[PDB]
Structure formats: structure tokens, C-alpha cells
Design a protein around this ligand. Structure first.
Ligand SMILES: C[C@@](N)(CCC[C@H](N)C(=O)O)C(=O)O
Ligand SMILES: C[C@@](N)(CCC[C@H](N)C(=O)O)C(=O)O
Lengths: 279, 279
């Protein structure tokens, strides 16, 4: 009986549920796992709920990963939700931006004329206690620090966009055995709440190639918070400028670490695929 | 604008299309590839068309694999189609069986009282020219014959259920590196039209454990024609009786090589997942 719309942001694909009638999500995390199963269910990297606003915001976003866990933010998902909300509001829409309450704070997507969505993703969080990670003291940053993974020492930088990211820079990102090494990063003891893991090949100071092993979703074709965190990590390590394209398997995102307000802006597409109803 | 229903037969999942208005499938193979993409489309192992009957049959089935190629039959798909047709007919249904025209001939699913579907899959085809394969002369069977794959010699048996199967018996089917070796069987030069490949672990004379690398779909959770062919191969090589359970990743099928009429009967479930409409 559950009605939903399938979206994807650069192939990071989601089940969107109109949940404006109640602050109670329409499905449990356990049901979200079943729904995200690609063979037995609808198939998705997560379920996103369009919920009633909180504390002045226009709406609230909650997301369940395909493993049922609930992360704090999702950049590809926010872009899908902004498109979804525009469709729900229809001709009653009276603005090009939504203020969206998330576990990570207020996030503000903007529908731009060219069909893209540009998102104010907030300030990056750089202290180890904010990731969270035990690689460094809670009040210290985590920049080009060692992380031993199955005997081999990786150089990693940690950034939070509300959710945790662990970024490592590599010569050939296509050659990373992501299915094998990804889980070992995700569940590394250094990360008490697990982490998302991004492998970054720097092509130039304004062009990064990214692959990601996501917390709670595995190999995905794109991750907005992950691209934001990777750009921040590339600036912090002096490898890139603050404006860059992040090329993902599903396509590109435009990332800016603004020097005006020190916030991260992420611009990318959102595509409605189909509407459906569970049997 | 395309309306569809998602089904799966033991996790072998399909997009079902009501195509009763024309003998011409309403989507092209190229569109079917897009629709089967699990991130950018609906996500499926194939698209199945419910088409007008031919030559006194009740309906016709055509199926496109997720690579766009068109195979001659699909057992999990016929079960899903039988369920779909029963839903389309509703209270106008006046029988428990459909005669369905396929490229492989007439196939007759029966809706049983317990909710399963028992399918008359027809006679197994055992001659090399019927597979087709060049392992033996066209008028010879292919039983425990050699096939060199990347320098290792495998013992294989070939059976056609309208579509080609290459069956090999192994001690530990879970240990097969299916993602790697599968494509090497599928595209082996010995198979002019490619082949489906089944790895079979005999648990007992009435219980086979199967994993499959499918022509045009890769690793799937179940294959009905493949389970039929694997049972035939297990009989031909003296390893099993003619009545057996075939355990697949998605669950079990009951297979019978009838001594009454020498035809193969396949019994299994079919589950309706959701209905949808493409944007
Ligand atoms: C990939 C992601 N959807 C984030 C999903 C949440 C992530 N899997 C986590 O668990 O933190 C995004 O930012 O675009
Ligand atoms: C797996 C299959 N759907 C057959 C699909 C067709 C197969 N991929 C082929 O190309 O012959 C079945 O019999 O249940």
C-alpha cells in the first residue's frame, strides 16, 4: 500500500516517500531493508522521507540506508528530495529554496534555472571528536594520518559533513579493489560509528576522481556528502583548490568550499525515474 | 508513461508489461536495457511481455534479458507471467492453466491451489545441434564432455530447454568464483549463441544445489530453465533421480523429468512486488 517515487542523483538511487501527513516515518528501518533489496524489493541505496518541518524549516529529511541504519545527511538524497518537494507543492511553490531540517542541521537546496540543485551543505567538521574517530585526540584535526588496514598503512584525512568520511588519495582509483578493502575501512575500530570511505585520484587542482564504499550501502555510483568531504580533504592537504569537479562513477558534482562563508556548496542533478505502489 | 508490474520468481526479478494490445512489444531491446539498469532504471533481470496468443494459445510470452538479447524461454518468468495474467483476468479467469506461446514452443503453467505454479516446460533437447554447441557432432549428445576454459579442463553436460545450458558438477558450489569464470563459459567459442552456465553440487540423489551465470544477465538468484537442464544433466550422468529439489540462492524449485511423457515439470513461486509507471 506504500506509495513512493524512485529518484537517483548520479545513480545513487532512492525511494522517496511523501511523509508530510505525520512526523512518524511511514516504514520501519527493517521494512526499509526489505524495500531496498534489489531483487526481492524495489531496489535502492536508501529510503528518504519528506517529513513536516521543524523549528521554522520548510520540511525535514530523514534517510534510512539500505542496511536500515539512519545516517545524519545525504547530499544526493537532498537534491532528490528538493525535486520531489517541488513536484509535491506544484504551482503552490513560491520560492526556489527549501530549508530542510536534518540530523546534521539545517540544509538548504536551491533549484537553479538549468535544472540542477545547488545545496548549502553547511560547515565541514574537522575535529576527530566530530567525525568521530580515535585516530587523533578529540580536539585535533585528522590530516594525512596513518590508518593500518589489514597490515598496510594508509594515509587518511577525516572530514564530517554531519556523517563521517575517511578520505585517502591514490594514483589509480579505478584499480582499487573496493569490494574487498571497503568493508575493512568502514568497520575499522578507529571509527566508533563506522565511516564512509572515499578513494580520490587527483587529476588536477580542480578535478578529482572519486570512488566510494559507503557506510550502510556499500559500493554506490555517487555520494554528495562524500564528494564534499573529499574536496575539503584535498584542500586541507594542499592537493586541490576550493572549487573542483568531483567525477563519480555516475557522473560529476560541482563542489565549492566558499571563502565567503566557509560553507560547502554542492551542485548536481536529480532524476525522477518512476512512481510506484507496493503490493 | 509505461505502466508495469514488478515480479520475482525466487529473486530472479522481472518487469512485466501488459502488451495485449499488439503483437509488437511496446519497448525496444535498447529501452529494456535502460529499464533493467538497477540504479538508473527500474532494475531487473529482464522484461517480460504479455502478448496476444498465437495458434490457439491463450497468450504469448517474449522476454528480453537485461542485456537486451532475446532468449527463447524463461521458467521463472513464465511463472511470473502466469501470475500476472491471472491478475489481469481477475474474476474473468475460468481455468487454472494457460497455454503460452514462446520461441521454444508452447509452455503450460498451472496455477495450483497452494499458490505455486507448476509448469510443463516441454521435452529437454539433448543433441549438440539443439543446444547449440560444437563440443560434439550435431546429432550427438553432450554428456560429461571436456571443455577447456582458461587452461583448465571442465567436464560439462549440455541440455537445451529452448535455450542453451552448460552444466558442470562440483564439490563445493559456494566456492566457485562465479563472477570470474562465468563469463568465460558464457562466451566460450564452443557455444555459437552463447550459453547459460550452471554449477551443481549434488547433495543427494533428490537434492541439487545450483549457482548460475546466465547468458545476458550474469549472476542471478534463480533460473528455472537452468534448474530443469541441471536435473536432466544429473539424470543423464547417473548422479540423480528424475525427481529432485534444486536449491538456488533465492530458494528451491521442484523439478520432475516425467516418466509418463518424458517432459520436464518445474514447480515454484511467483511474487508480485509493486506496480509502477515510468516518468
Ligand atoms: C551517499 C549519500 N547518499 C550519503 C548516504 C549516507 C551514508 N551512507 C552514511 O551512512 O553516512 C550522499 O551524501 O549522497
Ligand atoms: C533465468 C531464466 N529467467 C532464463 C532467462 C533466459 C536466459 N538468460 C537466456 O539468455 O537463455 C529462467 O529460466 O528462469
Amino acid at each position: 500500500a506504500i506509495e513512493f517515487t524512485k529518484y537517483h542523483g548520479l545513480g545513487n538511487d532512492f525511494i522517496l516517500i511523501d511523509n508530510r501527513a505525520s512526523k512518524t516515518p511511514a516504514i520501519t528501518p527493517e521494512k526499509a531493508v526489505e524495500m531496498c533489496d534489489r531483487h526481492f524489493g524495489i531496489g535502492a541505496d536508501g529510503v528518504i522521507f519528506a517529513l513536516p518541518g521543524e523549528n521554522g524549516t520548510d520540511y525535514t529529511m530523514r534517510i534510512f540506508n539500505s542496511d536500515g541504519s539512519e545516517p545524519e545527511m545525504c547530499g544526493n538524497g537532498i537534491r532528490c528530495l528538493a525535486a520531489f518537494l517541488a513536484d509535491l507543492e506544484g504551482l503552490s511553490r513560491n520560492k526556489d529554496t527549501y530549508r530542510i531540517h536534518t540530523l546534521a542541521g539545517v540544509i538548504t537546496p536551491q533549484l537553479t534555472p538549468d535544472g540542477q540543485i545547488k545545496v548549502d551543505m553547511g560547515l565541514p567538521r574537522l575535529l576527530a571528536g566530530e567525525i568521530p574517530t580515535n585516530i587523533a585526540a578529540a580536539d585535533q584535526k585528522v590530516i594525512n594520518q596513518p590508518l593500518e588496514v589489514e597490515g598496510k598503512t594508509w594515509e587518511v584525512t577525516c572530514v564530517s559533513m554531519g556523517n563521517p568520511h575517511c578520505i585517502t588519495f591514490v594514483e589509480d582509483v579505478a584499480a582499487i579493489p573496493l569490494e574487498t578493502i571497503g568493508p575493512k575501512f568502514e568497520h575499522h575500530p578507529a571509527f566508533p560509528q563506522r565511516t564512509n570511505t572515499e578513494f580520490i585520484q587527483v587529476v588536477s587542482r580542480d578535478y578529482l576522481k572519486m570512488r566510494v564504499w559507503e557506510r550502510g550501502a556499500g559500493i554506490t555510483l555517487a555520494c554528495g556528502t562524500g564528494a564534499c568531504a573529499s574536496l575539503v580533504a584535498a584542500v586541507l592537504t594542499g592537493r586541490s583548490d576550493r572549487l573542483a569537479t568531483v567525477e563519480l562513477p555516475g557522473g560529476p558534482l560541482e563542489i565549492e568550499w566558499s571563502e565567503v562563508d566557509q560553507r560547502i556548496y554542492m551542485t548536481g542533478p536529480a532524476d525522477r525515474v518512476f512512481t510506484g505502489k507496493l503490493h
